[PDB]
Every structure is written in C-alpha cells, then in structure tokens.
Design a protein around this ligand. Structure first.
Ligand SMILES: Nc1ncnc2c1ncn2[C@@H]1O[C@H](COP(=O)(O)OP(=O)(O)O)[C@@H](O)[C@H]1O
Ligand code: VO4
Ligand SMILES: [Mg+2]
Lengths: 133, 133, 96, 192, 240
C-alpha cells in the first residue's frame, strides 16, 4: 500500500465495489474520504462516467499532501482550540444531517477519542484521522 | 503426502546442507502444498533464514492446510459479488488478487485467470475448485 | 349512492397514496401546505358556496390573529413596543 | 371502518357539522406551526393577461389584508425568537461561548450577536426572546452561512473517513481467506 | 426598483394600486409586503416557474440580491425548518382563480429539487404524480375558474436540508358532492369523467360499454368542452 498512489487505488475499489466505473455520489464519498472538498462550480465540472484512471489523476490534482484533513482544522482558532462534550458534539453531527448510524458514530468515537475522555476537540479528530490512512 | 518426493526435493535445492525458506516454498509447491506469507513468517521467527531437513519437515506440515475448501477461499470474492450470480469479470477478479495480502502482480493474476477459462466472465467457486487441485 | 361511491373512491386513492408515502412513526419537523377553495360568487349561490366562503373566512380569522393580534401582544409582553396595531378583523362575520 | 347507522341522522353525521369540526382541527394543526402567507390576486374576470381591473384588485387588497400588513413596519424587528431557538440556529458562529456552562442563555445570545460584529442598535434582547433589526439579521445570517459551509464539509469529511474505515474493517476479515487463494495460485504456477 | 410595498413614501390606496399596476404589466407579478407576499395572476407562463429559476433561488447565497417570488418564501420556510428545527406551514390565499393551486405546485416543485443526487425518489415520485390525478378527480371547470378546486388540499412533508421530499401525507377534505350529479350551464363536471369518456382505449370502450360525453345524465352535454384543454392528452398523463 506504500505511498498515496496505492492507497487511492484500495479506496476506489471499495467505494465502487470493484466496478470499472464508480457512482457519481460514491465518487463524492471517495473524495471526502481523503479530505478533498469542492464547490458547486467544481462539482458540476466533473465527467459523466467516472473511471479509476481519472480518480488517480484527480487525487494527485487535489489531495493536500501537507495537511490532508485541513477542512476539519479550518473551523477558525477558537472552536478548534476548545473541547466539545461527546454528547453535545454528536448533537452538532446529527443536526448537520449525518449519514453515519449509531454504530458508525460509535466506531468514529472509538477512533477519535480511544481513551474514553469526558470531552473531545477537532484538532484531535484530524490528527487521529491522518494516522488512520 | 509422498515421503520419497520430500527427501528428493530437499537435496535438489539445498545449500551447504541447510535450505532457505524461499526454496522450501518452491519445494512445497512442487509436492502440491500452498505456503503463504503467514506460513513463512512463522518458520522465520524460529530457525532464521536457513533451516536443516528436520526444521524443513516441520515447515511442510504448516503448508498442509487441511481445512481448505471452495466455501472457505471464495469469502473475499463473495464480498464483491453484489449481483448474486456467482460470477465476476476477469477485470473484477484481477484487482481483488492484486490489492490485498500475498499481492500477486497484474500478469501473475491475468495469466492465472486465462489458464482457467478463455471467457471474461469467470465463476469464482469453480475457479477455487480448479486452483485447489 | 353515486355521490358516496365517487367521494370514497377519491379518498381511497388518497389512502392508497398515504399508504406508500407516509413516514413510519409520523412527522417530527414537517412542512405544511394549504390549498383551499377560494371565495366564489355566482348569480346563484347555495350551501356549496356557503361552505367555501366559510373556509376562506376561517383562514382569515387565524391569519389576522397570528399576523396582528399575537404579534401585538408578543412585542408588548417582551417589553419592546407598547404601541397598538390597527387592523380590521372578521371577528363579527366569522361568529355569525 | 364506516359506522353503519340507521334511523334519524346524528349531529356527527351531518355534512356541515362534520365539515366545521374537520376545519376546526386542521386550523389548530396550522396554529402550532410557523405559517407563511401567499396572497394571490385575480386581476380580471375575463381571464386575460396584462389586464388591470382596479375594483376587483382593491377588494382583494383588503380581503388579504395587504394594505393592513403595512403597520407591521412599526415593529422594526425582522428576527424574533427565544434564546434556545436562536442559540440552536446560530451555535456554529462560535460553539465556544455557545455551550458555556458559566454564562446564562440570555447572555450567550449577546456574546454571539456581538461576535458577528452587530451593535446594540441592531438588536434589543427582550424578556424571554432575542429581537433583531432587518439590517442586523442580514449580518448574522451572512456570517452563519459561511460557518454552516465550514462544518457542512468538515462533517462530510469525517463522514467518509469513517465510511472508508467501514469497508476497510469488513475487508480485513476476508483477507486471510484470500491469502489462501493467492498461495494456491503460486502453487499452480509452479506446476505450469 | 424595489420589492417591498412598505418602501413607498405615501402608502395610500391608489399609490399601492399603481405600484402593483406597473409591476404586473412589466411582468413582475411577485411583490413583497413582509411577512405577506402578493402574487398577481398573469394568466400566461412567464418562465419564472421553470427549473432554471428553482436552481437559482436554491443555490444563490445572498437573499437580498434575489427578487420577490414564490421560491423566496419556499426557501425561507425551509431555512427555518432546518435552521431552528420547527415545523413550518405555507398558505395560499385568494379568490376563485387567483392562482392558489398553481402556486402550491411551484412551491412543491421547489422542494422536489435536491442539491445532491443520492436520494430515494420513489416516495417523491408518487407525491408529484398525485397532483395531476387530484386535479382530474377533484378539480372541475366553473365560470370563475376552469381549474377550480372543489376539494380542500392539505399536506405534511419531510424535506431534506439540501432538497427533495423524503415522506408526505396528502389529506383532502370537502368534495363538492353536487358537482357529480348536477352542473350549471357553461360549468363542467370533474375533469376525470370527461377525460375517461374521451381518452379511454378501445378495450375499455367495449368492456365497460362507454358512450359519448353527451349521452350521460350526470354530465352537462353543452359544457363538455374546455378552451385550451385536451382531456385526451391529460388522460395519458393521468394513467402514467
Ligand atoms: N403564475 C401563473 N401563470 C399563468 N397562469 C396562471 C398562473 N397562476 C394561475 N394561473 C391561471 O389561473 C388558473 C387557475 O389557477 P388556480 O391555481 O387553479 O386557482 P384556484 O386555486 O383559485 O382555483 C390556472 O388554470 C391558470 O391558467
Ligand atoms: O379557488 V378555487 O377556484 O380553487 O375554488
Ligand atoms: Mg384551487
């Protein structure tokens, strides 16, 4: 799995279920899975049929190698600095219309805060997730 | 198991009496045994890189894998058969075998796929059945 | 018999629709929409026309209440504006 | 589930009585929500485009209380809601002072409003509610709509980084079963 | 130059009539008077209702730059439904033929449009296909309006924060029972009766033994035709 090239591959296979062509919405899942974000202007600026080849080029063309999960840290220098209580933080999650179920969010908690602390901050979620890849 | 073949296959690829794990796999695959990286890493922690005939026999016993069958080996292929036909394309099958574990190379996988059947659409069950013989 | 067969059939299609489109465990935060029959005056008006014009007057009574009567009391109770809202209500015609 | 009734018609079976009670129930259902009004005007009876008939329109200007809705300018405040409904809508502006244990809800509002640059003129914090001027509410929703976007992608990034881990963990279980396919293929390559 | 009626210096009866006169005739029917919104019936499609406009109000950031419309309201209603998590209600008010039923459809079409294409539109399919059936079965031609609603329609809809209807509940009340049996002159019965006795296939014309639109006692034989209405083409759309 060495560098990113072989790690982007493993991902495409999964999100398409080893399909030559991936689903449009599943490609949006796939880009999110590497800390890549787009505007409606760039979102419309995407092909009809999406293959593996394009994805690899796209990943190189996008994915910030310095900070992969910058969009987690982008929530200014007060919210990222302050700790959010486990339950109150999940309130924000469910409110922002999350797709993750009870188990999925528990899985996430088991990855983010594995010491089972009374509270959790954002700069920590990103740091764990960069070591997750 | 053939006692005559074991002694013959050892002497054929031995160096200064001892044998390298790499030769011991080739010799196991000559008998009809399938040693994997898990079988290799177990024998390596014990007697280093080079092993004598006695240490070599205890290696061939791990290569046996009696619990092996079609239903046991298809588990990864079945995880990717969402259409529920019992069939995967040669393209689909090749990527599975290249990405994870004892990562076979593209042409190692491609040739092994054609050696089974000329057809693109391959039944993973009949395939395991064939390669296990 | 013809009246009841048509009305129950029209409402059976509504039930068949609601059987497939309704959420299990009801609604939590839903979006209401109200399309009624608007004020209609002909040369000859009957009970049909009476029930329609009643609906319109009802929708108005609740409009005037929410938009004016309630807002006037809200601003006053919060301690913002003691000022009165001047408006015409159907209070009398709705009661008759 | 229709009541098979025989003899004299009951008060609950009478069309008008059955109509008013259905209407009555519907109105309360609407009173419990936050209504929005669309006031449609029919300009002429001839059913013709670009044809203005001042009488017919004027009656409708009264009957929909369009001219009467003008006195609502006197109020001067566009946004008006309790501390709770406000603080849930505008928590993203600064979750920090938003979920403060020491600071009270009346004062949390003040902080997040002043955080968004607003001055004591654009708002007037009432008895149980927070009021904002049309000018004031524009500022707050502009800042909130930049921050909603910040967390909208922030969540969607976490969403998939776990959805990825889902497919990953469900694949790791099949991996030893696959290693055996890969060891039996090498075995077959030795024979040929 | 401006959308809100309350921005005039003199807000007297004629001054408001003229402000609305010049807006309607220059084909700008929607005029605010916050919280109220005035929609004058243009009687011709201005194209301001099409998908292009839906997408505008949907994906446009500043609400200030956008002109008054049924979609301005549809977005601000959905902005509170998810913003504060409070149930909201839309109310189309006006006389017979003011544009209530049509405006409902436009605001329904707005909620039908989703930003991200990853939704189960199977539920949203039946929801939208119900309306041309509800107008065939519940709406009839009158002297006031040719698509006059003889029934009261009420909906409850769970809409996504990006768009698209997840679930719904169409609750119809008070159907004009008399319209089925007797109809006045130049006034027509429920559209579906005329639609079925014009657009039915040769198989249903023999199995049910269907006769001409004039041959029925429950149907006004002289009012049978409606201007600009093809009950055959409407029936095709009704069946699907
Ligand atoms: N925005 C509009 N553009 C064009 N015609 C319209 C518009 N709104 C309404 N109409 C016309 O008015 C007629 C009646 O509208 P409708 O919504 O059914 O009113 P109501 O609920 O009062 O019966 C429609 O059939 C249509 O021809
Ligand atoms: O307003 V209506 O014409 O639907 O009665
Ligand atoms: Mg109508």
């Amino acid at each position: 799995a060495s560098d990113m090239e072989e790690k982007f591959r493993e991902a495409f296979i999964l999100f398409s279920s080893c399909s030559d062509h991936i689903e449009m919405y599943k490609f949006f899942e796939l880009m999110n899975s590497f800390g890549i974000i787009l505007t409606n202007d760039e979102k419309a600026a995407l092909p009809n049929d999406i293959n593996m080849d394009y994805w690899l080029n796209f990943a190189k063309k996008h994915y910030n190698y310095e900070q992969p999960f910058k969009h987690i840290n982008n929530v200014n220098e007060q919210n990222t600095n302050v700790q959010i209580k486990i339950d109150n933080f999940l309130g924000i999650m469910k409110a922002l219309d999350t797709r993750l179920t009870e188990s999925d969010l528990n899985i996430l908690l088991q990855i983010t805060n594995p010491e089972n602390k009374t509270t959790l901050n954002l700069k920590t979620v990103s740091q764990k997730l960069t070591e997750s890849i | 198991v053939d006692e005559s073949d074991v002694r013959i296959y050892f002497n054929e690829k031995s160096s200064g009496g001892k044998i390298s794990i790499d030769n011991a796999s080739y010799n196991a695959r000559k008998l009809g045994l399938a040693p994997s990286s898990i079988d290799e890493k177990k024998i390596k922690e014990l007697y280093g890189d080079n092993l004598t005939y006695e240490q070599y026999l205890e290696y061939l016993s791990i290569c046996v894998h009696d619990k092996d069958n079609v239903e046991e080996l298809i588990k990864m292929f079945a995880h990717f058969d969402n259409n529920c036909t019992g069939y995967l394309t040669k393209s689909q099958m090749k990527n599975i075998l290249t990405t994870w574990g004892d990562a076979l190379t593209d042409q190692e996988a491609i040739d092994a796929l054609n050696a089974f059947s000329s057809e693109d659409n391959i039944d993973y069950k009949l395939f395991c059945e064939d390669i296990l013989q | 018999l013809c009246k009841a067969m048509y009305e129950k059939l029209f409402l059976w299609i509504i039930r068949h629709l609601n059987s497939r489109i309704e959420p299990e465990g009801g609604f939590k935060t839903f979006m209401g929409m109200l399309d009624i029959f608007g004020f209609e005056v002909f040369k000859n008006n009957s009970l049909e026309q009476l029930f329609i014009n009643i609906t319109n007057e009802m929708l108005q009574k609740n409009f005037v209440d929410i938009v004016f009567e309630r807002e006037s009391k809200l601003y006053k109770d919060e301690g913002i504006s003691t000022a009165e809202l001047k408006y015409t209500s159907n209070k009398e015609v709705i009661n008759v | 589930g229709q009541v098979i009734e025989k003899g004299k018609i009951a008060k609950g079976s009478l069309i008008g009585s059955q109509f008013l009670n259905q209407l009555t129930s519907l109105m309360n259902l609407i009173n419990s929500t936050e209504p929005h009004f669309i006031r449609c005007i029919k300009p002429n009876e001839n059913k013709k485009p670009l044809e203005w008939c001042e009488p017919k329109i004027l009656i409708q200007l009264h009957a929909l209380s369009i001219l009467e809705a003008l006195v609502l300018r006197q109020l001067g405040y566009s946004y008006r809601r309790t501390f709770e409904e406000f603080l849930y809508q505008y928590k993203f502006v600064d979750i920090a002072a938003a979920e403060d244990s020491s600071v009270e809800n009346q004062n949390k509002c003040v902080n997040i409003l002043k955080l968004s640059g607003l001055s004591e003129s654009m708002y007037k914090i009432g008895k149980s509610m927070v009021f904002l001027k049309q000018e004031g509410a524009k500022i707050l929703t502009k800042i909130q709509r930049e921050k909603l976007v910040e967390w909208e992608n922030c969540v969607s990034v976490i969403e998939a980084a776990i959805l990825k881990h889902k497919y990953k963990q469900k694949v790791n279980k099949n991996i030893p079963s696959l290693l055996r396919v890969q060891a039996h293929i090498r075995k077959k390559m030795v024979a040929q | 130059s401006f959308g809100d009626i309350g921005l005039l210096n003199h807000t007297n009866i004629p001054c408001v009539l003229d402000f609305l006169k010049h807006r309607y005739l220059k084909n700008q029917i929607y005029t605010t008077a916050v919280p109220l919104i005035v929609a004058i019936n243009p009687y011709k499609d201005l194209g301001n209702t099409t998908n292009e406009w839906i997408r505008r109000y949907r994906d446009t950031a500043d609400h200030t730059k956008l002109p008054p419309h049924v979609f301005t309201c549809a977005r601000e209603a959905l902005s509170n439904l998810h913003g504060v998590n409070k149930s909201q209600t839309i109310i189309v008010s006006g006389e017979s033929g003011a544009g209530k039923t049509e405006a409902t459809k436009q605001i329904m079409r707005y909620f039908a449009s989703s930003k991200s294409g990853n939704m189960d539109l199977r539920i949203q399919t039946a929801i939208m296909a119900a309306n041309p059936v509800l107008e065939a079965f519940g709406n009839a031609k009158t002297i006031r309006n040719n698509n006059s609603s003889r029934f009261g329609r009420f909906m409850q809809l769970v809409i996504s924060h990006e768009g698209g209807i997840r679930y719904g509940s169409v609750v119809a009340f008070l159907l004009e029972k008399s319209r089925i049996i007797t109809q006045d002159d130049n006034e027509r019965s429920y559209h579906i009766f005329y639609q079925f006795l014009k657009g039915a296939n040769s198989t249903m014309k023999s199995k049910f033994g269907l006769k001409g639109v004039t041959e029925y006692k429950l149907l006004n034989p002289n009012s049978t035709e409606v201007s600009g209405v093809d009950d055959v083409k409407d029936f095709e759309e009704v069946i699907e």
